[PDB]
């Protein structure tokens, strides 16, 4: 026979011409029976065909083909401790994926691959099978079913040749656990290669730190029982003796810092050898040379051991190289923020000799700025340059601020409008902008605050504030309580240190009052102001224009801007009357937050947060009641109703205005009041002191993808507000609101979330210490700072 044309039939996917030209006996040659057999073999060699049958007639051949592709889908079942994605990766690495050839030869290869994976994750006894579904189409999907074997358990960790230290004491530092105590099970007992290597390194480091310079791990054997249930691990140790560090010797290119290096390498006599201190000395020399510009020094320790005296001499070689310079400083990831916003926090300058301390200071300032979720730095060498580096800062911007608005109809406050635009980094310009506005049947409140944190290049800040707050207790009849206030505040701040700042500003406030229900404290203040309104009726009015000199001091050394784990922040805020104002008083408020990390990973943090306040009048007057302090709620004492902690009003018997007898009134003469009244109406006090003690724990069920966006803690709150001008000698039958001893206490669970809507705070609290007249609020919700 010869070949002229091939009539393939059933050739589903591969080209007919490609199949024609694949066979080495191409068109235009003689064809024997062995040539036809070789043609069948070569067609089978493609790996796509499971059946090849050829019929011959002279110069023409026809081939019948059946197709092995495709895999329609890959599914996994039976897994209970592993996901499916690493299994799919293992299949893809094995050469099997969706859309390719489903060769029946590779089924056992898949079985062995899954068996080897479970061998590698310590579940050797796993049993695995494959199932394929016969679809009518040429595509067929597969279903992997496997019974995961019982995990091979660690049965004994043994150490041979240890004599100075107890075996269990040596084991106690290993990540692999010999046994788990049943009354405080906090872990499990499993084998893994990297954990075993880390435990061996921990054992080496422990023996080296306890003075055994010539310590050696002779051999290690891991063995498993014939039933595949237990694993035995043993380590052989020749520990040697303890070696005393006779002294150090520094030699090399010290670059003129020999005195500081020698102070770094100070050794007291009789000190035992220890590799942690050797490494600490090496790293300290590296840091010392780096902060002078020597970015890449070579430091190697070459100890010499004298076995006769059991002493070691710690020779160390230092080569500082050359001083490095910063060619450029680059910022990556600032999609919204200006370049200057990040660059003005820098302490390293472009076109100057490098300082690693300066780079770290810039990173810390960027972290304290609070605009970025993560801040990372990279000092990379300039290619083709021996003594120049590029400093690159890579940041991930955080969703600073929140924008709110709301509309209501026919509700408790009638038709209602509200809107709030809080934004710490306005459009990436660094400006802090805060807009708040409400309009309901009772309040028409607007407030605008805009602050530039860098009014000059040195960090001087300029800021302002406008507010208008008009309150009416009733929409009609004009004779109910009215409290209209407006005013302006301008502030100036400047830095005095790397962590300390001072503020100084001028404020003006106008406050107008009318038709206030008579009260002991408020009429005490009104008598102090020289006003003499009557207690028999609600008809009264008052009006003040006040100019205040504002001042402040802020110490801020927090680790970060939004969820700190270290450092403290102390903010003092005060104001004093400028002469010529109607009210004469002073006011001072003190904030404190201290973060103490217990675990080196900074996942467990103790936060001690206190807030103090005080204010009083000057020259015989008293501090206005609009400057009072209030406590309770998310900000100060969680678990209590907001602003309800503190002094409560004591009313006088008076002819109430806008009286309608089907409602409840505070002690009207026409309702029948004859004497003064105890109430639960919070009015605040001139003195305030709250404290809290938070214990921050990692969120148990949130993965590392969103772990930095959520914080949960267990808190304990204290706080009290009292009125230092109360006179219990006159009002003996009423509670002593001058007493600061009425500390209100609470405990509970708090959860904070950096939501895309803004900072959200959840808190459930139990006010276990509570006085009469206090309103509790177990579940509390707050949006923002």
């Amino acid at each position: 026979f010869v070949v002229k044309d091939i009539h393939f039939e059933g050739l589903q996917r591969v080209a007919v011409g490609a199949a024609l030209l694949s066979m080495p006996v191409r068109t235009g040659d003689t064809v024997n029976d062995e040539d036809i057999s070789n043609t069948i073999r070569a067609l089978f060699a493609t790996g796509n065909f499971e059946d090849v049958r050829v019929l011959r007639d002279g110069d023409t051949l026809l081939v019948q083909v059946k197709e092995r592709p495709t895999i329609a889908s890959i599914t996994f079942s039976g897994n209970k401790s592993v996901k499916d994605d690493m299994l799919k990766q293992n299949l893809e690495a094995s050469g099997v994926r969706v859309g390719e050839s489903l060769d029946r030869t590779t089924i056992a290869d898949i079985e062995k691959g899954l068996e080897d994976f479970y061998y590698s994750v310590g579940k050797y006894s796993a049993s695995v099978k494959a199932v394929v579904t016969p679809l009518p189409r040429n595509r067929v999907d597969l279903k992997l079913v496997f019974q995961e074997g019982v995990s091979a358990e660690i049965q004994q960790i043994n150490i041979v040749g240890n004599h100075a230290f107890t075996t269990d004491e040596l084991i106690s530092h290993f990540q692999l656990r010999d046994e788990v105590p049943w009354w405080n099970v906090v872990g499990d007992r499993k084998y893994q290669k990297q954990k075993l290597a880390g435990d061996l390194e921990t054992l080496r480091s422990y023996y080296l730190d306890r003075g055994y310079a010539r310590f050696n791990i002779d051999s290690t054997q891991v063995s498993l029982t014939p039933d595949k249930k237990g694993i035995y691990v043993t380590v052989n140790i020749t520990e040697g003796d303890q070696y005393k560090l006779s002294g150090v010797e520094v030699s090399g290119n010290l670059a003129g810092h020999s005195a500081e290096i020698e102070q770094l390498t100070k050794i007291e006599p009789g000190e035992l050898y220890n590799g942690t201190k050797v490494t600490k000395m090496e790293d300290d020399i590296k840091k010392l040379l780096g902060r002078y510009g020597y970015a890449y020094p070579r430091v190697q320790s070459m100890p010499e051991i004298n076995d006769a005296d059991k002493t070691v001499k710690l020779r160390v070689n230092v080569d500082a190289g050359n001083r490095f310079y910063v060619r450029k400083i680059r910022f990556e990831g600032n999609d919204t923020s200006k370049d200057a916003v990040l660059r003005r926090e820098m302490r390293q300058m472009e076109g100057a000799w490098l300082g690693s301390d300066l780079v770290d200071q810039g990173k810390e300032r960027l972290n304290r700025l609070g605009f970025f979720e993560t801040v990372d730095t990279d000092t990379q060498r300039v290619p083709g340059s021996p003594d120049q580096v590029d400093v690159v800062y890579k940041v991930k911007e955080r969703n600073t601020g929140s924008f709110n608005f709301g509309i209501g109809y026919g509700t408790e406050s009638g038709v209602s409008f509200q809107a709030g635009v809080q934004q710490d980094n306005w459009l990436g310009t660094g400006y802090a902008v805060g807009i708040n506005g409400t309009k309901n049947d009772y309040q028409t409140y607007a407030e605008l605050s805009v602050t530039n944190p860098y009014f000059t290049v040195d960090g001087v800040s300029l800021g302002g504030r406008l507010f208008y707050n008009d309150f009416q207790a009733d929409d009609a009849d004009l004779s109910d309580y009215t409290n209209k206030s407006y005013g302006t505040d301008v502030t100036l701040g400047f830095p005095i240190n790397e962590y300390n700042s001072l503020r100084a500003g001028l404020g003006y406030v106008h406050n107008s009052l009318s038709n206030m229900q008579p009260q002991v404290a408020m009429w005490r203040y009104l008598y102090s102001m020289g006003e003499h309104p009557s207690t028999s009726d609600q008809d009264n009015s008052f009006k003040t224009d006040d100019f205040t000199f504002n001042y402040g001091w802020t110490y801020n050394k927090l680790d970060r801007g939004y969820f700190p784990t270290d450092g403290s922040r102390v903010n003092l805020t005060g104001k004093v009357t400028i002469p010529g104002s109607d009210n004469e008083y002073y006011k001072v408020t003190l904030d404190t937050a201290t973060y103490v990390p217990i675990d080196d990973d900074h996942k467990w943090v103790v936060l001690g947060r206190t807030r103090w306040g005080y204010g009083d009048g000057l020259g015989g007057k008293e501090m206005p009641f609009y400057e009072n302090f209030y406590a309770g709620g998310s900000s100060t004492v969680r678990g209590f109703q907001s602003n309800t902690i503190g002094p409560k009003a004591v009313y006088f018997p008076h002819q109430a205005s806008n009286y309608d007898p089907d409602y409840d009134y505070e002690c009207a003469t026409q309702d029948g009041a004859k004497d003064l009244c105890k109430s639960d109406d919070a009015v605040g006090g001139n003195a305030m002191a709250v404290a809290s003690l938070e214990f921050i724990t990692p969120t148990p069920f949130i993965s590392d993808k969103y772990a930095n966006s959520v914080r949960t803690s267990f808190f304990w709150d204290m706080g009290t507000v009292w009125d230092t001008n109360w006179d219990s000698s006159q009002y003996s039958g009423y509670p002593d609101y001058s007493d600061p001893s009425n500390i209100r206490m609470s405990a509970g669970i708090a959860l904070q979330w950096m939501s895309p809507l803004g900072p959200l705070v959840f808190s459930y609290a139990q006010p276990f210490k509570k006085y009469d007249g206090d309103k509790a609020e177990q579940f509390q919700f707050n949006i923002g700072k």
Binding site: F403, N404, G406, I407, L757
Partner: peptide
């Protein structure tokens, strides 16, 4: 994101 109940509407700008 926004919610409405008892004829009161509040909306939060997200992102």
């Amino acid at each position: 994101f926004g919610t409405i109940h008892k004829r009161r509407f509040r909306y939060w700008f997200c992102g």
